[PDB]
Design a protein around this ligand. Structure first.
Ligand SMILES: CCOC(=O)Nc1cccc(Cl)c1
Length: 284
C-alpha cells in the first residue's frame, strides 16, 4: 500500500499511537547480559537502553571489551550503521577506540551537548585547532582541522592519530544542531538535506567501515536517521518503489538494537521524511 495513502489514512483516523504500540508489541527481544554486568554500570547512560549480545560492538582489548553500541546490518539495502549512546565522561576514549577499530569515515551527531538544561553527552571533540585532545586510556590524539558552521548543521574535519603506530586518518563530524528540545521538526526539509550532505561525503559507502550515529540514548533521533536512509535506498533499488513497507524495515532494524523510534511523533516524522524524500527524486 503506497505509504503516502497509508499516511493520510492514519492521520485522518488519528491512530499514530495505535500503530506505534503494535510495533512495540511485535519487536524482537534478545539477551543483553554483557551490558548488565556490574563492571559495566558506569559505561551505560540509561539503565533501560542496552545493546543485544548478538549485535554489540566489541572493543579490541582483553581488559573489558564493552561499549554501548550496536551493528545494524541491512542485507537488501547493502548498508551498515553503528548506533551508539552519546559518550560519557568515562567512555570518550572507548568511543574513539571504536571509530579507529571499525575504520569509520564519519560520525553523525543528532543532539546538542546541553538540552533542556541538562548534559546529554560529553564534550568529546576539540573546539579549537591549537587545543588538541589526548585519550590516555586508549592511546589516541584528536585534532580539529576545520569547521564549517551552517544554519541547520555544522561539518568538522578531525584528525585521529593512533599514538601506538603514528598512523593518522581524517574523520568527518556531521552535527545536526537544530532538532528541537521537545517534539520533532515541523518540516523534514532540513533533516533530509543533512542526510544528503552525509551521503555526498562518502561516509555511508562500502569502501569505509560503518558510519557511527548517536543522539543521547542512540535509539530515537538515531533510529530516524538510519530508517529514512535505508527506506529511500530500497525505493531506488526495487522495480516497485510502492512495495517499501516502513513498519517492516523498522522491525528488521529492531532485531539489531532495541527501542529504535521512541515516540509516535518520531514514527510520523520518519514517514514524512521518506514520503517527502521520494518527491525531488521521482515526481516533481
Ligand atoms: C526512490 C526514492 O529515493 C529518494 O527519495 N532519495 C532521496 C530523496 C531526497 C533526499 C535524499 Cl537525501 C534522498
Amino acid at each position: 500500500m503506497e505509504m503516502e495513502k497509508e499516511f493520510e489514512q492514519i492521520d485522518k483516523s488519528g491512530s499514530w499511537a495505535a500503530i506505534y504500540q503494535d510495533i512495540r508489541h511485535e519487536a524482537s527481544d534478545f539477551p543483553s547480559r554483557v551490558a548488565k554486568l556490574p563492571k559495566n554500570k558506569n559505561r551505560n547512560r540509561y539503565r533501560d537502553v542496552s545493546p543485544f549480545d548478538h549485535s554489540r560492538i566489541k572493543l579490541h582489548q582483553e581488559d573489558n571489551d564493552y561499549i554501548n553500541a550496536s551493528l545494524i546490518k541491512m542485507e537488501e539495502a547493502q548498508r551498515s550503521y553503528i548506533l551508539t549512546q552519546g559518550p560519557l565522561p568515562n567512555t570518550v576514549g572507548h568511543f574513539w577506540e571504536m571509530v579507529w577499530e571499525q575504520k569509520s569515515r564519519g560520525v553523525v551527531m543528532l543532539n546538542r551537548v546541553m538540552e533542556k538544561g541538562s548534559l546529554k553527552c560529553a564534550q568529546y571533540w576539540p573546539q579549537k585547532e591549537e587545543k588538541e585532545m589526548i585519550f590516555e586510556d586508549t592511546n589516541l590524539k584528536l585534532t580539529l582541522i576545520s569547521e564549517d558552521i551552517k544554519s541547520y548543521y555544522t561539518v568538522r574535519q578531525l584528525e585521529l592519530e593512533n599514538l601506538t603506530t603514528q598512523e593518522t586518518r581524517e574523520i568527518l563530524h556531521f552535527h545536526y544542531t537544530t532538532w528541537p528540545d521537545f517534539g520533532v521538526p515541523e518540516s523534514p526539509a532540513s533533516f533530509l538535506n543533512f542526510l544528503f550532505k552525509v551521503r555526498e561525503s562518502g561516509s555511508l559507502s562500502p569502501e569505509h567501515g560503518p558510519v557511527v550515529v548517536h543522539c543521547s540514548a542512540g535509539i530515537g533521533r538515531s533510529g530516524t536517521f538510519c530508517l529514512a536512509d535505508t527506506c529511500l535506498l530500497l525505493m531506488d533499488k526495487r522495480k516497485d518503489p510502492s512495495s517499501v513497507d516502513i513498519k517492516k524495515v523498522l522491525l528488521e532494524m529492531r532485531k539489531f538494537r532495541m527501542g529504535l523510534i521512541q515516540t509516535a511523533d518520531q514514527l510520523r516524522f520518519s514517514y514524512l521524511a521518506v514520503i517527502e524524500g521520494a518527491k525531488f527524486i521521482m515526481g516533481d
